[PDB]
């Protein structure tokens, strides 16, 4: 945790964590406007990032073999 910056910018920030959404997804498999901002903060991503993450995960309209779920 630190702040402040001038001319020469400090080293670049580390990569985000998708684990937060990965677990939550398989855990509940339901994105909520309330869990959107809460999760995004964990994965260190933008509110839009999480929205696209789940949206992309969801079953898109297309021809698929047939994944066994239950």
From Swiss-Prot:
Tissue expression: Ubiquitous. Strongly expressed in adult testis and kidney as well as fetal lung and kidney.
Biased composition annotated in UniProt, kind: Pro residues: 8-18
Ranges of the DNA-binding region feature: 8-64
Subcellular location: Nucleus
Function, as annotated: May function as a transcriptional regulator.
Subunit note: Homodimer or heterodimer (Potential). Interacts with HOXC8.
Protein name: Homeobox and leucine zipper protein Homez
Gene encoding the protein: HOMEZ
Span within the parent record: 453 to 509 of 550
